[PDB]
Amino acid sequence: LTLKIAVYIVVGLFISLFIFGFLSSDPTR
Amino acid sequence: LWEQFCQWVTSTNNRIYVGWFGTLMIPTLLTATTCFIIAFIAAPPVDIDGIREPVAGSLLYGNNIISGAVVPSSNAIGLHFYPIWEAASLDEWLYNGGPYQLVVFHFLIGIFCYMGRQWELSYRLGMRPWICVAYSAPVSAATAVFLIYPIGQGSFSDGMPLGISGTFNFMIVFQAEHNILMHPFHMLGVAGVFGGSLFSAMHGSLVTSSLVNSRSLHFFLGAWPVIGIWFTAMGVSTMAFNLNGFNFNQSILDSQGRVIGTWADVLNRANIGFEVMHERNAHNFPLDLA
Amino acid sequence: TKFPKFSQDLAQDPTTRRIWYGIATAHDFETHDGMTEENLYQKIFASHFGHIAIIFLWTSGTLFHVAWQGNFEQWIKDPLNIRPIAHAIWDPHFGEGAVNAFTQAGASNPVNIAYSGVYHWFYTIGMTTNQELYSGAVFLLVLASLFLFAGWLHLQPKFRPSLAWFKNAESRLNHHLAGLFGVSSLAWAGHLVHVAIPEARGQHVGWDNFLSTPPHPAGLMPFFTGNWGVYAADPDTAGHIFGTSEGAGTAILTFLGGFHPQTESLWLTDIAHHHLAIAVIFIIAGHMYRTNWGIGHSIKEILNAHKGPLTGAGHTNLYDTINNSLHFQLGLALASLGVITSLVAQHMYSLPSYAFIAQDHTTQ
Amino acid sequence: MDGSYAASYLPWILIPMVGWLFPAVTMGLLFIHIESEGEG
Amino acid sequence: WVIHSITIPMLFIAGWLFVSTGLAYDAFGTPRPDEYF
Amino acid sequence: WSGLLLFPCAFMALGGWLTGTTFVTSWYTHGLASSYLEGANFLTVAVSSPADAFGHSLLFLWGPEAQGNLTRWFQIGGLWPFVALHGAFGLIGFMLRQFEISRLVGIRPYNAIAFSGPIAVFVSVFLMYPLGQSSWFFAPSFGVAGIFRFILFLQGFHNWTLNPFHMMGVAGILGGALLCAIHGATVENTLYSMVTANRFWSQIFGIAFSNKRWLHFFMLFVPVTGLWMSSVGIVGLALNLRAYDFVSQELRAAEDPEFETFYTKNILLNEGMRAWMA
Amino acid sequence: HVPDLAFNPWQEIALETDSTFADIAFTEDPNHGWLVGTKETIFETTDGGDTWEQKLIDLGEEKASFSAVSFSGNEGWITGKPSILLHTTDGGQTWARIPLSEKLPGAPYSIIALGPQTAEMITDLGAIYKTTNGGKNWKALVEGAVGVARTIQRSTDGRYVAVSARGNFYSTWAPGQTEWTPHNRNSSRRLQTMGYGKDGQLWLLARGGQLQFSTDPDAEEWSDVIAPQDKGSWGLLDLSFRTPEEVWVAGASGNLLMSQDGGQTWAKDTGVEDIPANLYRVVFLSPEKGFVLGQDGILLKYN
Amino acid sequence: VRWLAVHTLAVPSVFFVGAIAAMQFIQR
Amino acid sequence: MALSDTQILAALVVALLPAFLAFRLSTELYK
Ligand code: CLA
Ligand code: CLA
Ligand code: CLA
Ligand code: CLA
Ligand SMILES: C=Cc1c(C)c2cc3nc(c4c5[nH]c(cc6nc(cc1[nH]2)C(C)=C6CC)c(C)c5C(=O)[C@@H]4C(=O)OC)[C@@H](CCC(=O)OC/C=C(\C)CCC[C@H](C)CCC[C@H](C)CCCC(C)C)[C@@H]3C
Ligand SMILES: CC1=C(/C=C/C(C)=C\C=C\C(C)=C/C=C/C=C(C)/C=C/C=C(C)/C=C/C2=C(C)C(=O)CCC2(C)C)C(C)(C)CCC1
Ligand SMILES: [Fe+2]
């Protein structure tokens, strides 16, 4: 069951970075 | 450190633009590529049909590039989500065609994020974002043939096999059980692609000759195949819910009612033949054997 | 005699009354010969598809005739001095005097004068050229074709809905409240923000360039970060001239209230915030009834729970009564629609929404 | 009886059909159908 | 209008009568529903 | 010259089609109602192939066939060779017209070589394949459903998908459509301005087009290449077949119930189609 | 989540083989029984299936996948594709190979022993034969072909049904006819399997586990679509009748579900859900003697 | 020269459409 | 600008399709 948690945190942090980056970029938004 | 990372991500001075959509495009695309290569090399045989007739499409199991493919998930799976952690063991996942689902899902997310990165870069550079509009049609077609059709049919095994021979087999069975040729939307897609190739040839020849409204003409010519692919994707998605093509068989009757039959009946006969790969009854099988 | 096929009592009548009553009881599907509930519901479904397609065709015809024989492009240059034109006149029975009398509104032929007030509506929603009207008419033709084909399709044996599908109140209410009402209102607000307001402020925006023209200078940043007030700053000043960039603000959602000083109508940004807010409220309302996830209310228990010591049984068993009776539902819908239509009239003569429509007294 | 709109000749042929041809055609078709004693 | 007022209208009913009875079937050899076996 | 010879014959090539789809049947040749006169709709109607009893006969009206009888010339199915010949000569007239127009303008006749693709496709599918076949009966019909039936018949009897030439033709058609769409989008998105589009494509894909010359050249030469490869595949079909036949995999799957391939299933489908009509 | 079965009446045995188990058969209750499967694997028990011993056998070609095993009295038959038949009358102590004639249409699929020296041969291509000389002579009851059939099921009284090569339609045959009657599928989704219930009616499993039951002898109309796993989209693989009322269904990843009401409500047997195998066939020889054949040498025994 | 270039297809067209219109009732 | 003759003719041709679909729907509803 460790694999499920591993992939879960991987995708969670990936989408967290994806949603944070758009807020970071001030130009063109 | 975060600010420099964001600046490098959004920078247009980089060798290859990544974009914040790229932060999701790269992992999904790389996962799809890696798992696709692994399955195409050493995938264990998969019982797609659900009977005691396993099918193996890997190269290590005696296949070439033309015949090799990635077998869709087992018919016992259906539409159920089948990740690795939901399997009792890795062998169970391998024998149930899970790599197909993994590759398909990560690759679909990757192409969606490719759309996102395309739009993001077009907006950052200030260029008009119509390249994504054109790119929608192949993406819509891929989603229809990889996701919409399995959902409509109630099984992931009905999707397009990831290969060359599997593609032809899928097209043949699709025609057999759906009559896609008689459907007006495959007709519209065929018209769109043929017209697009025609326009490409005309304009390439004209430019080559001239090489030692124009904008309206260029845009309409470019939009023609995009519209055609949109229509064919719509047709495949409608087919997925059993909205089959035109069935003109059994139509024309004579004075006393006897069926005359047209070429539509011949197409129906061909479809039935591709449906069952042998002869019908009353064909004098051997009466006795030793 | 064959007609009417649905009643053998009328078909055997030797008199001409069979011709009359056959028309009268034609669309009374309940009393037809050998009618079952499932067939009744499916036929009603197809007929409703047909009425929808007819409505779309009628709207398309209005648009097409206005675009073809009207003076829309001339009318927008002077809405307070040019009569809108409904359709051209072609009457061979006319004489010279009638031809001279009816050649009005600057036309070069006999023509009518529109009083439906659709020129003001088309001007307000954004469309300003004849090609836009023509495109709208063609699109509505296509929509009518799609709905007619849908009515044909959901009549085939492989697509005929089951009786249990029709009697699903909770799912119908959820979808028709969150989706039919909320999503349509949200889309209309998006149309007003993305197209109508910039067009009314002079900036031309259409299908060709709406993908590269942000409705607001700050795109999706204040909305997502919670700083919504950014979208209400710099509204349209009192000196704004409709359709031009003189006195035009940049706010896309305001709460100005009152009327535009020039058009004597409501501000477009007010309409945007209004339809957006009601869209949000309707989307919230559409998540109330339990369909397939356990959560949500069930209408039967709510009705049966609101009893009372004075009324006796209260609202018990009303769910079955309303669900199993199409006439009860039709009466409820008709009463609600009549009240809403009265409200539309009363709140529309006093609160005009279209530009320069309060000065056209005949249309009002 | 002329108009300045595009394709002014259309009402010259469309209105008669909607005025005479279509009404008479459906009139006769419906009259035949309602008196059709073939079945009931 | 004079040269076209007669040429067009007659041919429609001409074709209607030509195909309404046993002329086209014998002309092009396409069997009638009776001749079909 | 060639400017006013293509127009008449092609008209007849057109004309015999409509009367070939509304009045003349195939009950004596194919046993089907291939005419509208029986009530067949637009998709169902066609111009049926001639009966196989005449072999490769040109089916001239004045000639020994039909002995000059027009009704016989209809019932023998001479309309198919009639239409095929007239259409082929109309196509060659169009080719010559393009050549002479290019000569008059003086530009290099790249449009002629661009249109050479469809010329080859038509002269191979509807003229050469029946020549290499037994008779005109196996030739494709002139209609909607007839073309689909011909396609399915070729799939059954030749494994046409596995032929590398139809693979190249599919690749050419899809690449031509891709280049057309990308060209339209690029032209209407840069509104020359080539350098910024090159930069955009470099940052998106990795490489771009140095010149509009190369892009236009490639979109000109992709679909014509696909068409020419498909025509060459038809050439090979008439002659000894050449497809990537994997007899070893077939042998392995013949006796091993645990070995199966998509190629093996395609073979099973092909012989299944080939089995149950004669 | 579907309701979970509280009690597990199935005991799991993990045989040390990777051969998928196809069929089981018995002679007498206190007597030996046999099971046949893939890769020329045959297992014989004598205590009622509690323990098994492997029988090893090799031929000139090592690609004999056994499909059916049928025992009547002391006579036994084992049929596998490609064509291979092993017949005996000694309880399987020694097996006589019957070299099938070349003119047999299609690889054999199933065999039923109608008693001593009586057997019926079913071929995947639809051909049906009858042998009464212990394989020496065959007789064709039907002289027709149905094409490639995914699954063929035999009714209690000898009637045969066969799903098409892809589940588009099906073909039915009854004794007394020389042809097979084709019939269109009665479910919107494409068919996966079809069988005859012990009540005498037919049951169809479509794609995505859409179980449907039939009523009346013609059974042209069918009952409402029933999904034993509700939101679960697992595709079921077999349906079995322990009793004409209680029903069992077997699917993937050990998804074994049971209905105490004949299909109206279904409980998930989480006791066998942990099994790392794909259950294939649940056979109920008796209401107490039942066997679930899956994959990778995993079996379930009733108690 | 456009006179014939139109009439050569105009005459057969009007000849045929009348028959096609009559066609929907002859088979009835 | 004002419309063109081809625009009106194309509108008529497009409107031909809903006519056919409505004919089919009416015939189906008559059953
Ligand atoms: C004259 C013959 C002819 C022609 C021209 C066509 C033409 C077409 N058919 Mg068709 N067909 C025919 C005969 C024909 N058919 C016959 C006879 C049959 C019966 C067997 C069929 C059965 C049939 C089926 C069953 C289907 C078609 C489909 C199609 C369309 C394919 C478009 C496509 O792939 O989507 C566009 C391209 C894609 C979706 C590919 C994915 C593109 C993504 C976006 C990019 C992927 C990149 C990749 C990862 C590699 C990257 C490279 C590098 C950067 C790493 C097209 C309109 C398909 C369709 O309608 O599509 C919806 C379809 O499903 N046909
Ligand atoms: C002899 C008297 C007479 C006649 C015959 C007409 C005839 C006409 N006038 Mg007219 N007119 C008249 C006097 C007359 N006018 C007078 C005195 C004035 C005042 C000066 C006008 C002012 C006038 C204007 C201002 C206009 C006309 C227009 C028209 C045309 C409308 C087209 C039409 O009817 O199709 C449409 C047909 C209908 C709407 C049918 C409606 C009536 C039926 C009965 C309703 C259907 C009921 C039922 C469902 C039918 C079932 C089906 C049926 C087949 C059985 C038509 C040619 C219009 C025009 O030229 O534009 C086209 C227009 O704009 N007229
Ligand atoms: C998101 C999902 C969705 C959507 C969009 C719809 C949409 C629709 N359904 Mg529906 N339906 C759904 C799910 C959905 N359904 C489900 C899940 C079920 C099964 C439980 C059904 C079962 C069902 C049945 C049984 C029927 C429908 C019907 C209809 C149509 C009725 C016409 C209508 O209300 O529009 C017009 C009305 C509006 C758009 C809103 C009303 C106007 C508001 C209240 C006030 C006015 C606003 C504004 C001021 C006016 C505009 C002014 C402007 C012109 C200037 C409509 C298109 C009927 C039909 O036959 O249609 C084909 C029908 O009989 N539905
Ligand atoms: C319901 C909508 C509607 C209505 C009431 C009208 C009304 C009119 N049109 Mg018009 N039109 C419409 C839609 C409509 N149009 C659309 C959508 C088109 C595009 C195809 C046209 C194209 C058109 C042309 C080209 C011409 C007219 C003309 C006319 C006038 C002559 C009468 C007539 O219609 O017959 C003639 C017109 C037609 C037969 C057009 C077809 C009608 C549409 C396409 C179908 C409507 C079906 C309708 C919903 C059926 C309702 C059923 C109900 C009775 C139970 C009249 C003012 C004529 C005119 O201007 O004369 C002055 C003329 O020449 N129309
Ligand atoms: C879908 C296939 C297809 C069709 C139908 C088609 C058609 C056409 N392309 C033309 C041009 C071209 N085609 C080009 C590239 C291409 N064209 C392609 C594919 C096609 N091109 C492809 C794939 C390419 C890329 C290589 C170029 C570069 C040109 C041109 O220069 C030219 C143009 O400018 O376009 C407008 C026109 C030739 C006019 C002519 O010869 O006048 C004479 C007309 C004759 C002789 C009639 C043909 C008679 C035929 C053979 C028999 C009768 C046909 C029946 C009516 C229908 C039967 C068909 C059944 C399936 C129903 C015509 C509109
Ligand atoms: C999706 C989506 C995205 C991008 C969306 C983009 C880029 C565009 C979206 C456009 C959409 C979503 C809808 C457009 C709808 C238009 C409609 C529905 C028109 C209907 C018209 C009717 C019904 C009636 C028309 C009329 C006409 C024509 C008239 O002329 C008279 C008035 C009237 C009668 C009203 C992204 C991924 C970024 C985020 C997630 C959401
Ligand atoms: Fe170009």
Author numbering:
A (entry chain I): 2 to 30
B (entry chain A): 13 to 224, 267 to 344
C (entry chain b): 3 to 366
D (entry chain i): 1 to 40
E (entry chain E): 20 to 56
F (entry chain D): 32 to 222, 244 to 330
G (entry chain S): 31 to 333
H (entry chain F): 17 to 44
Q: What did the published study say regarding this structure?
A:
Photosystem II (PSII) is the multi-subunit membrane-bound pigment-protein complex found in oxygenic photosynthetic organisms that catalyses the light-driven oxidation of water and reduction of plastoquinone during photosynthetic electron transport. The highly conserved Ycf48 assembly factor binds to the newly synthesized D1 reaction center polypeptide and promotes the initial steps of PSII assembly, but its binding site is unclear. Here we use cryo-electron microscopy to determine the structure of a cyanobacterial PSII D1/D2 reaction center assembly complex with Ycf48 attached. Ycf48, a 7-bladed beta propeller, binds to the amino-acid residues of D1 that ultimately ligate the water-oxidising Mn4CaO5 cluster, thereby preventing the premature binding of Mn2+ and Ca2+ ions and protecting the site from damage.
In addition to the isolation of two types of RCII complex (RCII* and RCIIa), a larger 450 kDa complex consisting of the RCIIa complex bound to a monomeric PSI complex, which we term here the RCII/PSI complex, was also detected in the preparation. The preliminary processing revealed the existence of two good 3D classes out of a total of six, differing by the relative orientation of RCII to PSI. The final cryo-EM maps had a resolution of 3.2 Å and 3.1 Å for the two final classes. The overall structure obtained using the 3.1 Å map contains a monomeric PSI complex consisting of 11 subunits attached to a RCII complex consisting of the intrinsic D1 and D2 RC subunits, the low-molecular-mass PsbI subunit and the alpha (PsbE) and beta (PsbF) subunits of Cyt b-559, plus the Ycf48 accessory factor. We found that Ycf48 bound to the lumenal regions of the D1 subunit via an Arg patch consisting of six highly conserved residues (Ycf48-Arg180, Arg196, Arg215, Arg219, Arg220 and Arg237). Instead of folding back close to D1-Asp170 and D1-Glu189, as observed in the RC47 complex and the mature PSII complex, the C-terminal tail is unfolded and wrapped around the outside of the Ycf48 propeller, with H-bonds formed between Ycf48 and D1-Asn335 and the last four residues of mature D1. Overall, the binding of Ycf48 to D1 disrupts the binding pocket of the Mn4CaO5 cluster in the D1 subunit and sterically prevents binding of Mn and other ions to D1. Importantly, there was no indication in the structure for the presence of bound Mn or Ca ions. Although Ycf48 interacts mainly with the lumenal surface of D1, Ycf48-Lys93 lies close to a negatively charged residue (D2-Asp308) in a loop in the C-terminal tail of D2 that in mature PSII binds the PsbO subunit. Examination of the interface revealed that RCII mainly interacts with PSI via hydrophobic interactions between residues D1-Phe295 and D1-Leu297 and residues PsaB-Phe161, PsaB-Leu155 and PsaB-Phe151 in the PSI PsaB RC subunit plus chlorophyll 1208, and by interactions between the C-terminus of PsbI and PsaB.
